[PDB]
Amino acid sequence: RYKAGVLKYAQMGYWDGDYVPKDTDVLALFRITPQEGVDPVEAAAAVAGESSTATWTVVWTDRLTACDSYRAKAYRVEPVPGTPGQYFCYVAYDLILFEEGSIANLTASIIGNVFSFKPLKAARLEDMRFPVAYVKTYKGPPTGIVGERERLDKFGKPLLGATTKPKLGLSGKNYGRVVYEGLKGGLDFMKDDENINSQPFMHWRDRFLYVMEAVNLASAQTGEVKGHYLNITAGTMEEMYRRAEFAKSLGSVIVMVDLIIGYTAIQSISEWCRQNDMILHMHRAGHGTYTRQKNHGISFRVIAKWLRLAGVDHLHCGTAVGKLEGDPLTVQGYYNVCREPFNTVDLPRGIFFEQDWADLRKVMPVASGGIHAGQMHQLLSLFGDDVVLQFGGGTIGHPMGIQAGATANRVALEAMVLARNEGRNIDVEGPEILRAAAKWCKPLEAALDTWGNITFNYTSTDTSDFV
Amino acid sequence: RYKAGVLKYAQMGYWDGDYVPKDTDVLALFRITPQEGVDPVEAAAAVAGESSTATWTVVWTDRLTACDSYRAKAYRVEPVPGTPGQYFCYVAYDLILFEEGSIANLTASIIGNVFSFKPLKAARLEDMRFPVAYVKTYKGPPTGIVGERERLDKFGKPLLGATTKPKLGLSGKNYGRVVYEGLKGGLDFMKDDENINSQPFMHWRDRFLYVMEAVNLASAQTGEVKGHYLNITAGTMEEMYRRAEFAKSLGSVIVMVDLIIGYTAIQSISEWCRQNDMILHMHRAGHGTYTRQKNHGISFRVIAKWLRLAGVDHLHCGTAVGKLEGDPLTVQGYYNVCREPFNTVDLPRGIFFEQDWADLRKVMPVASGGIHAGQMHQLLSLFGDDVVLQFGGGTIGHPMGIQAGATANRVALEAMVLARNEGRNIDVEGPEILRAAAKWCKPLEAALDTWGNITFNYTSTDTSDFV
Amino acid sequence: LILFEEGSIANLTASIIGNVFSFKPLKAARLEDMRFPVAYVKTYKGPPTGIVGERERLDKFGKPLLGATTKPKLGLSGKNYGRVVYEGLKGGLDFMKDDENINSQPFMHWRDRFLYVMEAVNLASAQTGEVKGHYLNITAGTMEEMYRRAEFAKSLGSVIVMVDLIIGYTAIQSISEWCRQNDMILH
Amino acid sequence: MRITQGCFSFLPDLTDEQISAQVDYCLGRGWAVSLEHTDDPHPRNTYWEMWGMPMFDLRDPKGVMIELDECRKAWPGRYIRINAFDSTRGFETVTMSFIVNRPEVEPSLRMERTEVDGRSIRYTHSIVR
Amino acid sequence: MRITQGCFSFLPDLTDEQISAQVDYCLGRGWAVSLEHTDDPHPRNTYWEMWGMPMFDLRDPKGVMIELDECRKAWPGRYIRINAFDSTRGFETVTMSFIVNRPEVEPSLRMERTEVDGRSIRYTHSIVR
Amino acid sequence: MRITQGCFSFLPDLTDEQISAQVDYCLGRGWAVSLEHTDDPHPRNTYWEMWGMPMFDLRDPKGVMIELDECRKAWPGRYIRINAFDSTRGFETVTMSFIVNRPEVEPSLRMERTEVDGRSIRYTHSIVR
């Protein structure tokens, strides 16, 4: 088996049906659609091969190292129910192949070159198991759910947010005025847009100064600890550290970071935020490029697992009822990944492996994108308390102003939490509770008339296969 | 048009058929598949909206800033030939929205949230036009094609490479021995695998020392300047700079970097490489996650355009005849993007916009993945001279050894270049030239017998629409 | 595992062997053996080179490596100390070493010793054709003095430096981080 | 020992008929042909002794061959190479380089190892001739 | 002058009967036997010229001895050594190394002293041959 | 190979009549004439072996020429030069320097290239003689 020539991956020693994975093994699922003629066993072994220690032809240098330990092994292949030509493939990897405390190395191995293979039509990474031995090498999130709520002294309900609208255009003076009117109205957080950085119309260092004056003026007049997600996303790391150090110098509670910057750049801020007492917010920009398609890419639950290990306190996980793509059961899957310390296997919610995080900090999930006061009963029923609800359009787009829009969303949420704890069903009586609160609250009545019939309903692309 | 309520994107002012784009405008193509019921004009305006300065409901803060300048405008929509329900959409963006010298800001705007939209089934970014005003803000590649060849003193043929096999497993002592036997045989470059970093079996600092001794021993015995692509990919930037500084300290010619690390992390090394006289190699790991699918994702030609602006000297562009996905005409498109200073619109090669780079350094494209001595005539005809050909399996997997395998590939290439310049047709007579060279060269004859009928032929997924 | 800090020997000892020994209800207690889980060992970096890594650097295989302690323990001046090292390594020994109590005494300063032994190492290396070494003692009062002794040992081009156990696990883990980042073998 | 600096090194020594064919390709594309010689064939040694001025506007491959034979008579025991120079908007560099004449016996390279900080080695390549 | 690089150096030169007994130990434990040669016997010089491929699956000590005598005929004035390679889970390295053939006269080493900052000296070991 | 260190190097070798005329210019302006010799003609090598003491108060060009012929008899295969020294308020330095006697065959310089950090090279010029 070491003579010169081209041999099949199943014959080379990558497929083993009788193999039982150990407790110290990285497990990965692959939703493989093979080409016409290619066997699913050969398709699995090709994925198991190139992701670890294989090439197209046999080399004599394989006899030097103990290959039986280093080679990844595909152990079982099962057909996906519903689809005629699609297969689940379980691949086991050993800890000897992975670097301690590196997301970049983990992705270079598993999702390296397996996607661009000719014998496969479409491959998708569904779920990934991490052993207890591997999770302990990572530091985890800087604060978590517990650590953040103690800093802000806010308990018993979702934290409210709003994106400063419009996205681009506003100068430093006027940008802070929208922030000031938002936070004083009743919002816990305001934020920068993902594209806002250091544009010619408004410099970053000017924005940072004017929002911090708006935060402290709102904090004095309400008596609450307010915050603004300061966008530090830059071209280089040298610029990025300088933006973060100035954010610390002003005394900001929390800074935001885009997903585009890369896992190597993300892990650097996670180390920085812990060593300077800062809460980290992640905005998933350009995630839908490789997440939305059900047949090809990487499922968000795997990305959420990597981002928990990298060390982020906040993460956008999606809204089931919002303007963006999301299926209620699949969305709840992403929420359970970043919150629960130990999650059991559940096929309707898209969990395939029993994951044990072993005392890593809980990432607080953020629901954002096309939501308002009328959607409040559905949001509280699906997720719970330890979430962040963001109303970008639903606050500023209010007919009365910004202060009234912030009050309308705050009154709506406070009425729902009070009704839920008393023993009233928030799924059925939900709309009636909001109408009853509108009798004494005038800004809430105006908000319900504006966005009453406005609902984003479309067929979800990323759906479950066991329903 | 500023009263509170939900209005359509076409009515809001994002679609304009009579609009003619200026010379200082970032243009983007989108291959949009809309949902059943959604109009292509509305689908275009939704993409044009969210990528710049829009939200689902109208805000009063829009009246503050001059929105007519900041809003992105979709100017024409044309149906894609061949497909019944797919449309090309041309979106124009103004320079006021983009930060000077930042890839991360450019991606946060254009490919931000437009993919995850419910009214669109699948969207793909085909091509992007950059104005002369925008390209000049970027530094470009550290050396280029011209700068690199002058350093190595090698002219008139493709530079030869080989990946050290197996991928993982080899210890520091033995790893350098494979490198030594490769370079002395006739290869110009050896390289680390993309997953190799700092594993428990072999530490990085040990690898760096042993390969550099192997480089200099090969350089003394052949009389040529040899190199090894040293993988610096790490978890954090602090670890990454320390790996690069030690690579400089040994006196290495060229270091390699994975694409996963992120554009923010990439631009930092590009600044470092210029200030320390280093050539930068890019390995595209995990690119096929969002590139391979024809209906959804980002085409590699756009990624190549970003990587040229970021500043990389080498880039894997793909092989038409290799084991990995690639269509001959579409592959030539990626080569023309990174080499040619000015490229005209060509629909068979996938070029849609007339791009003027204005004196940015030429990125040298790398052909790798499932190629051998028998494929030499096809490689020289498709691309040309200013390329890097890498034979990972085709060198070490040779029956005689590593030195013979390196000689076999070198003799094969030298025979083809000599035949091409004399006036012989390398497309037809190609196999006969290699057979005639095998009479005096014995390692070449053994290489042709091993991989003669072995050819990777499969239906390409990423294909042209104008054929 | 909830009780232990990731990558710290000092924290592990503060928990287990903390106050249990000094108990009145116990006459005598002894810690015999300890099990570490796979989850806990991975947090630590481990030895800088190991058995495999060291033998490849010295190019010596198939037998035990030979050493000798420079006698007498204390007394010898910088000039004469290197002469004993020179005669040892040329005779057939792979290593010579400093005594555990030798640091920076009034009779012989450390920076003088470091210079004279390195000349003796290279003279022996040229005459035998083998890679020779001397375990340079870096044990100091403070960490600031200890890093300065190590950086000078690297500057001369020494293969291996030695460290006493007394200095403490917190001080030991600091050199282990330093030796990996500067290609040094730790004794 | 054989110094493989340049193109067509692994192939057998090029005859005058083969050299004339290779220059014909260079003049066809519009490159300036120049002859260079040295007795010091070090790697990364940039500048060799130029045999006169480069032939910019010469549309005959035979004219180069006369200057090549003249250089061989003047310098028998030296490395003679042909350099084709491109003069376009972006290139402005050498395109082809190949040794046409190499001495009776090729000199070997001695490597001197200077031990610096840690385990790092400074390497010095020196020609015996 | 005698270069003591490797095992059994201080002992007198090993006869073919003794070499066969030493290889028998290496093949018994399951190690790959490889022959290496050089004319440059520098300390810390890692890579010697390999005589073919290492013998992985060979259960006969006589088969190694044929390749040893073949290497002696090709390279008379060179340092030939035997390297036994271990292929286990943790080792993956050389286990035994000993010179079997050394040239008629052993070359000496010259030490060059470069004066740097303070009293520090950079040393350079060079072979006379 | 010809070492061009100093004035009048590109001109043909100066005759005794021409040297006497050049010294006459130096003594006229009031400069001290000194003879220096070496076998090591390195660039930036400052100090050559002085032939006695410099002639400070000598108002005859013939007196220098006697000491020049005496130096040629003692050192035939050495580089002899004349140094005119100015002794004013601001100068206090050498004004004229020219080689009058150079050996039968001029020694060449070998350049050794030490590779350091990045692409930087330390150069070492060494005389073959």
Ligand SMILES: O=C(O)[C@@](O)(COP(=O)(O)O)[C@H](O)[C@H](O)COP(=O)(O)O
């Ligand atoms: O740009 C936007 O659309 C938003 O500001 C929401 O604004 P509205 O509240 O005005 O819709 C959010 O950034 C998206 O939710 C991001 O997507 P995801 O949640 O998928 O990260």
Ligand SMILES: O=C(O)[C@@](O)(COP(=O)(O)O)[C@H](O)[C@H](O)COP(=O)(O)O
């Ligand atoms: O891992 C591999 O397969 C390779 O080493 C090729 O090895 P062989 O030559 O042994 O096939 C390259 O990294 C791929 O070409 C990367 O893909 P791309 O070229 O698409 O970046």
Ligand SMILES: [Mg+2]
């Ligand atoms: Mg936003």
Ligand SMILES: [Mg+2]
């Ligand atoms: Mg690879």
Ligand SMILES: [Mg+2]
């Ligand atoms: Mg002792």
